Amino acid sequence: RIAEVDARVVREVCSKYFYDQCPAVAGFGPIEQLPDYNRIRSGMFWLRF
Amino acid sequence: MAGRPAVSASSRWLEGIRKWYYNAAGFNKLGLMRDDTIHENDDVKEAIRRLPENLYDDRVFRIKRALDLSMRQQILPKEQWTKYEEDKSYLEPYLKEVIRERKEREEWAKK
Amino acid sequence: MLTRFLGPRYRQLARNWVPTASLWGAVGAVGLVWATDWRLILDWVPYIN
Amino acid sequence: MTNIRKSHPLMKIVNNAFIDLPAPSNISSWWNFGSLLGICLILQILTGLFLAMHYTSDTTTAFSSVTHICRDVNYGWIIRYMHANGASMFFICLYMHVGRGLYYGSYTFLETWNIGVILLLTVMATAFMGYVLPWGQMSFWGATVITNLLSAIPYIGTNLVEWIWGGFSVDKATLTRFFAFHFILPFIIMAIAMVHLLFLHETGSNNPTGISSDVDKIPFHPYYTIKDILGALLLILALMLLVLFAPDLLGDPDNYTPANPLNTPPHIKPEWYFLFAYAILRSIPNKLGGVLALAFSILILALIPLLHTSKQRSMMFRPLSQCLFWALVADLLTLTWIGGQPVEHPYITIGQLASVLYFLLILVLMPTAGTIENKLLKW
Numbered sequence A: 001r002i003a004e005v006d007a008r009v010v011r012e013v014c015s016k017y018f019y020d021q022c023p024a025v026a027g028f029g030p031i032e033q034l035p036d037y038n039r040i041r042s043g044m045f046w047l048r049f
Numbered sequence B: 001m002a003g004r005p006a007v008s009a010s011s012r013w014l015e016g017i018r019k020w021y022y023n024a025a026g027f028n029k030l031g032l033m034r035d036d037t038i039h040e041n042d043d044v045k046e047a048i049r050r051l052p053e054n055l056y057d058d059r060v061f062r063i064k065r066a067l068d069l070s071m072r073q074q075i076l077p078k079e080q081w082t083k084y085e086e087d088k089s090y091l092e093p094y095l096k097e098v099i100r101e102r103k104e105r106e107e108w109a110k111k
Numbered sequence C: 001m002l003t004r005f006l007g008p009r010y011r012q013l014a015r016n017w018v019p020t021a022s023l024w025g026a027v028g029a030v031g032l033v034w035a036t037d038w039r040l041i042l043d044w045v046p047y048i049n
Numbered sequence D: 001m002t003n004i005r006k007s008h009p010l011m012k013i014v015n016n017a018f019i020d021l022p023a024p025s026n027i028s029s030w031w032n033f034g035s036l037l038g039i040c041l042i043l044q045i046l047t048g049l050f051l052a053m054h055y056t057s058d059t060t061t062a063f064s065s066v067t068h069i070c071r072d073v074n075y076g077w078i079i080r081y082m083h084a085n086g087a088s089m090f091f092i093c094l095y096m097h098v099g100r101g102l103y104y105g106s107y108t109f110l111e112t113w114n115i116g117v118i119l120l121l122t123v124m125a126t127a128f129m130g131y132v133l134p135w136g137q138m139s140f141w142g143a144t145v146i147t148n149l150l151s152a153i154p155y156i157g158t159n160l161v162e163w164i165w166g167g168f169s170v171d172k173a174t175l176t177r178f179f180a181f182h183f184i185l186p187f188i189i190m191a192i193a194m195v196h197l198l199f200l201h202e203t204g205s206n207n208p209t210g211i212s213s214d215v216d217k218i219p220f221h222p223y224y225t226i227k228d229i230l231g232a233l234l235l236i237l238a239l240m241l242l243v244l245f246a247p248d249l250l251g252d253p254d255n256y257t258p259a260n261p262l263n264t265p266p267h268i269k270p271e272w273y274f275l276f277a278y279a280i281l282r283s284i285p286n287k288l289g290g291v292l293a294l295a296f297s298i299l300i301l302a303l304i305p306l307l308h309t310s311k312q313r314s315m316m317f318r319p320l321s322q323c324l325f326w327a328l329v330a331d332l333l334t335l336t337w338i339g340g341q342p343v344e345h346p347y348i349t350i351g352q353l354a355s356v357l358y359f360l361l362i363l364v365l366m367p368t369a370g371t372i373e374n375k376l377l378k379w
């Protein structure tokens, strides 16, 4: 199964679970600088943030 | 002995005028005490820096939730308002010392 | 220093700047007169009458 | 390569004030007028430049060129009216920008507030100078009465009145000067407005609560840009409603006849955003008193920060001052209503009372209001 993974598979698989999906964020400590969720959400796609 | 310089205010007695004004001011509806709404000048800001951690952290959340209420244009439920009798000045003792310190410093300069 | 009186120090400071402030006002006076050849000022000077 | 460390050694670092600037979360809609004011500047300059490509300042061909703009130029009729009604939207937005500072104690930002008054004075100068450009018996005569007020200044009045006029009265010499002056001043306003923000971003913004909002700041980009865009549309809707459905609703009909120095209009009056100041000047029979009261009322804004008395900043928790604030707004509307009416016996009495109350409220009643509540709150 490892030998059957290539760039095309990684690009397709990553875009299916990472691209445009809503992430879950957990913070702890001095997280004042931590960006707002909309800033975090808009980081899930390119050329449209 | 409250309300107005006269022995009796316009709307009967004197003590109830301040109680009436507290509900009229409406900062209790937001869950803020009286000293949580004070103007932060170069004097009050220093007197905040002397607050104990237990009292300073409590003030932060009371302000933090009030801005959430103001953002939504809402108020706390009737049971969560700051009672006029239960409202206590947690900043007056600290303000007075900075008043005393600043007055001595200012008057010492002119001598 | 005398038992923290009411504004003695600033009176002394003001008197130091009075001679220069009085002469500074001459620039505001003469300079304004010099700017627009004001009629009733350029009459007492001997050369510029 | 750090996406956060963007093209920083460029002009974007300045633009971080538009994207990553901390702003209070509880900002109400009354703050939107700051961004609306900037849009009003850009809209006025955009339409103004295209108007200046067909307007000619010579008296013999000033009014006729305005008619040629509407009648002949393709889509030139709308541009003339978004300019005429954009100034109406400008002063609508300008007066709420001042009012919010009065209510929410934003004048505690002494540097920003003082630059704000300078910005206010510059626009009223630009609006007054641009009204004379059409040269239409309201331009000539509206400028005649207001400019002649400077003759009341002692020992220098007539010297500078003629120096403003470029002659013995308003004429072609004054008209050409105004158009050149009307062209330059708006670009000065952009520079001052940039300075206006520079004195504010260092100290942050204000909130309706009036307390420090450092504990609940939010990024500007995803929350207020879309809030200002919605506010911008409400401005475009309101401005376009006048332009497309009642273009001459606010402007006086008498302005459509060519200026005639030998003939006077039935009633003389400035635009609606100066009518509040016209009433104050007309209150006092004295000439020197009237011009001073006209200037003092506008310049009283700089005196407001020195009159603060309450230990609370905003008027949110000051019910006694709230009753006075809307009394001042109502009185300012009374001054606006009585400004456009002829000086007769009912408006002479009401005019004096409204004017004397305008200064009495801010100078006496409002500072006394803050003192009374300060005693009422054990401090």
Ligand code: HEM
Binding pocket: D041, D044, D045, D047, D048, D049, D050, D051, D052, D055, D066, D080, D081, D083, D084, D087, D090, D123, D126, D127, D130, D131, D132, D133, D134, D182, D183, D186, D187, D189, D251
């Ligand atoms: C804050 C900026 C400005 C304000 C508040 C303003 C205001 C005004 C007002 C109230 C009028 C009277 C129109 C009428 O009553 O019919 C006017 C006319 C005019 N303005 Fe401006 N103006 C501004 C900027 C500019 C600029 C930047 C230009 C040129 C580049 C310009 C060019 C003109 C012209 C040519 C007229 C005469 C044409 C007409 O009245 O339709 N304005 N302006």
Ligand code: HEM
Binding pocket: D030, D031, D032, D033, D034, D035, D037, D038, D041, D094, D097, D098, D101, D106, D107, D109, D112, D113, D115, D116, D117, D119, D120, D123, D189, D193, D196, D197, D200, D204, D205, D206, D207, D301
């Ligand atoms: C063309 C004219 C003007 C422009 C473009 C302009 C622009 C702005 C903008 C964009 C803001 C920030 C927006 C906001 O915080 O809501 C602001 C803030 C402010 N301006 Fe102006 N302004 C103008 C005229 C004035 C005037 C007439 C005043 C009269 C007092 C003024 C006083 C203030 C004050 C007090 C603030 C504080 C805002 C705060 O407390 O958050 N400005 N200005």
